[model samples]
Target: AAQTNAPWGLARISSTSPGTSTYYYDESAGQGSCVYVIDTGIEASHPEFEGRAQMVKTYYYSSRDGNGHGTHCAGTVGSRTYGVAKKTQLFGVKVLDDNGSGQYSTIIAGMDFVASDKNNRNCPKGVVASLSLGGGYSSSVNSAAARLQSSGVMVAVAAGNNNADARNYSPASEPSVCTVGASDRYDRRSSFSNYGSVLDIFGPGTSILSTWIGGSTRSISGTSMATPHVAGLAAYLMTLGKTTAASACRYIADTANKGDLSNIPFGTVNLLAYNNYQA
Candidate 1:
């Protein structure tokens, strides 16, 4: 029923099943591309993951995903049922705790781990980093991200839910990342979504149903809920042969829909998340 009834922002159940989709490619659409969900953590054993999710590190808590946010985000990132790139590799980096407490140090550690790819190879191509956390600003994290971009990696961050200028937020204000805001089912900017000219795009965030802990699913909101779609999009593009950062630098999400957002945070968010399989 999930697939058949998936929200309009995701897959089209009747028109596009596993074996077929609207994309120009076949099964080779998401293979080998990696997405790092640097959130609270993920349920490595979640049914939606299909064994593609791995715990990369933990700073303030175990990689157990005490809070369900990480798992939900991961589900949207690469779940076989709810993901944008079902076949992509998913990595979990625990930055905050159950109470959502974290600092810039965690981000640096996470980025360094991916930038070097454990082997410290300077973050080769086909790697995408997704950060949904926000608080105050952090230039250190921004610098690390820029370094990783130079090393060839796709970076996407949430614009935060403060309903203020996203430019005042870390990572989101950073020019190196694709800062994402939230849009509801009607394609209107979420009431809590932050806006500013710095943010690069907007995505479906309200009433988003995705995988959760204990092998279940749930619906939630926030710009944090919007970031993964774009991250998954970047990885899916890599599977289609846009392998390097430079190769797909300008390959923005297919923002085709219009007049859906009421807030229009940042200049012109007259855009929509182009679900690779949604038609």
Candidate 2:
């Protein structure tokens, strides 16, 4: 059933069943949307970005990515080659730092910036924010996320690598945000991925190939790698007039490949994300 070429992560999301290397997606494919990566920072110069990624704001030390986490996440969200929303504009909002660590306050700062930026008259019609980092439950972070969604920006967060219930995590546990879990190529839950009713969907996260610092690419794993797929999907949906966070999340859930994933933890929804393209 393969009609074209795609990376495994991209291929996995575009199909209901696995084992295909082809990716099918809408023609518009996030042509008029923006996705903000709230992570370490993105190496916007990476060739994979194809001049579409740039820095929006920095909450930590600098704009450069000492840790490659942010760049990889950004690539998955909207890189021309590696992204789900290939045409979406990408903006890096630095919150985490060199070690890929940040305090809740700094993270909230980034979230606040996204919320405020969305209020600008010049902003794109559809907007998304991807958070690939998380910690223990922090009500402060949860509250900030709620406010961000209120500003009409869809928020997607990682379920954490704790391999425990996602309910133990902060923004992932927050009801207003779309929490994502990690799945492998076989559509089985990743062993290191957090789960529970808090997770809204699963995305391919194991050894995902994406852009890195210095204009390179690497394969890595973690729920961190899974969240941006949801972010990108939401961004694409937003371009189709699913402007609100609630509406986008609902569409993703309703259109997802249900009951197709294995090794799902108890209480977790058995839905895998899809881009609604058939080849």
Candidate 3:
């Protein structure tokens, strides 16, 4: 029931441009593959997400909506109708209770759940896992992420909405994780997206339209929105025979539009060449 301002609006070049959608339509969204979204609980019954999200697993670590931030984040990643990976299965791991704060132990426990869940059988074979949450960087988190990557799980994480240095978070700073930064329709870094050498890629996260609780729809902003776009793209790449996370990352980076790189900070990720690389 809480309202939040959406991030970026659709930019002409990214939205209406035939060139943009061509790659999406041709390369991504072809099948209803599964993807895992680790975040606050999702409104599974929302009309937009009805029959689209496969809640193979869910954990409610908190008791309140935490100002509705987690749900909003989940809607951006996997909510159908407005979701990037509409058909992908989402695993909602609510490590942070409704208060938007949680212990590091709980967060790590959520990761363990994902890693051990049916030995990764809950997610479709070769599907990617998306994480839109993060906290301060830690060696423990990096170790866990490395294990996940070694186990063949491709991860996409938010670079952070702090607009500070990208070296600030766990999963994002982990070298094995594909850290994603936010960009507007024009491909410029969003004012709030954290950037630095730790950043791995860029995605459209500003002012995105997505699902909300109780069968509602709304637009929200943040690096959360950008993570799903890349998640969906990873699924698309898998369909094209790029299965491993390293290979998929290579494919995405190689194909991004180089022109978009000019605005990003030095050593920050630039995925502008992704489209052409796919060709």
Candidate 4:
């Protein structure tokens, strides 16, 4: 069966109503920036990655993606087809296992590695980390993410899929972490996405098409899908000089399509992520 012809998530950020299928972005949007995908692992050899994605670190023993979550998220961040920042460097920080499950210890280790790597990288724009995995609230996990942010890495985390208040989720609830919620193509919050003021912004997530394992593409839904969109946008902003995590978040909120989304629970931010592409 044929796909949607184009990835809607990319188009959504660059257009509002009467939207075209084009994702207008600066050719140098993510240049000199690195995006770290903290999840299972990325299929770096996938053609969609255009030889830009690499597995730089892994606690899961191998740099392979038995679970496609990380690759999908990475593609959304920087793949040629579905990425928000097509030119950004993609790094896979494998913390989760083949089954896509990981303990807080492993997740924190990934955060530690990201912090260390970001401090030593030669990136001119900045570093961004997309973390799509989470469980219940954990202070340690939140602290690690905070540290990564302090290390100058803009961190984008997914709100939980529980459809409840996001404050109950760590990293999402962490003040320093940029929490992202899911919104559909219709500009409505995904029914299953966590809400509450803890969420900083929303991103296209429902039925998002992106790279998959086995060198293919697939569509999936969850707040996990939304987080990478923010990560990519953050990287794009970095290229435009919004280098720090706080700076990126401020720009995201300042230029966001505010109040454009519906069904946003009270206290949850109503800002939908935008790329400032006026086409």
Per-candidate local distance difference test = 0.72, 0.86, 0.62, 0.88
Q: TM-scores across all candidates?
A: 0.86, 0.95, 0.82, 0.96
Misplaced by over 4 Å in model 2 are: 1-3, 121-123
lDDT of 3 by residue, 134-238 (tens): 789878876776666666767888888998887868778887778888877666788889889877777777777666665666767788778877776676556
Model 1, 1-279: lDDT tens digits are 124445544642112222222232235446778888888899989988989998978886377898889999988888977777778888888887766667787777777777777353222337888888876677877787777666677888898999888877887878877788887766578888888877777777777788988899999998987888878777777776754554443555343344445768447555555543432
Candidate 3's C-alpha lDDT?
0.62
Q: Which lDDT tens digits does candidate 4 get at residues 36-65?
A: 999999999999998999999988679899
Of the candidates numbered 1 and 4, which has the greater TM-score value? 4
RMSD each, Å: 4.3, 1.8, 5.1, 2.7
Please identify model 3 stretches exceeding 4 Å from their true place.
1-24, 27-32, 56-74, 118-125, 273-279
* Candidate 1 error regions (>4 Å): 1-3, 11-26, 118-125, 247-249, 253-260, 275-279
Per-residue error for 9 in candidate 4, Å, reads 0.9
Task: Quote the lDDT for 154 in model 1.
Answer: 81
Native-to-model Cα distance after best TM-score fit, residue 82 in candidate 1, in Å: 1.3
Candidate 1 clashes: the total is 6
Best by lDDT: 4
| Candidate 4 Cα deviation (angstroms), residue 17 | 2.4
Error of 3 at 199 (Å): 1.2
